[PDB]
Amino acid sequence: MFEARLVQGSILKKVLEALKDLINEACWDISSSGVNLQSMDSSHVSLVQLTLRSEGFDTYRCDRNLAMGVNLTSMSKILKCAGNEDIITLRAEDNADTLALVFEAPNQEKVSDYEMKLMDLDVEQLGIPEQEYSCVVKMPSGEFARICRDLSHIGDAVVISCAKDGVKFSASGELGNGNIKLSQTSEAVTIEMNEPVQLTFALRYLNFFTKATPLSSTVTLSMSADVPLVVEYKIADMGHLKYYLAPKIEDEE
């Protein structure tokens, strides 16, 4: 019997608003450690890794390890019936194929209770190869978001070039081309370059990743030659949300 109490319920809201457009149906792994979710996107071009540690919850409790095949769209809709201030409570029954969302409004004169139908998902599981990264860029999530929106008007893909001094994003299309340059501080931008890197990514997906912006003031980007870019947003004391995007390769001949 699962039961978690989250006082800053807006966090849950923000999480679903960050997964719903990228993932239709996902699986929520519950355990004494906390909730966790890992899923490729529809396109199978990226992987989302959500981590909500039980510590972050104001009351966690997991008797039986659960695997809830959830329709993120239904859960999102349901979650919009919560005030950004209500206390949200996830509660399930190891025997029931339904999850329960209870929202308690601060002043407790109102309580919403939603029972969402779960589903059997035979989701294709993947395993991330723990690796090292040539470059790690920390920067305001808002700036990152803006960058991705801007370039989106120029072209479909963005070339992320990371050197010693700073990092550079650039694109090109019908209406010419452009690029944005960020340099380390001396709101700040920190860069850890062991090796200059250059990779091409689709702005379409980066733009999906950015729906997580309201989850953190900052975001870190981790790249490396010929490997998936890592876009990660921390969820203060709760855990995090990581997005892996496969790069675009140059088909030679």
């Binding site: 396109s43 790069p247 140059e250």
Partner: peptide
């Protein structure tokens, strides 16, 4: 930078 690759080509199932 041309063709989009799927994460499967980097992550095994």
């Amino acid at each position: 930078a041309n063709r989009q690759v799927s994460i499967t080509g980097f992550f095994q199932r």
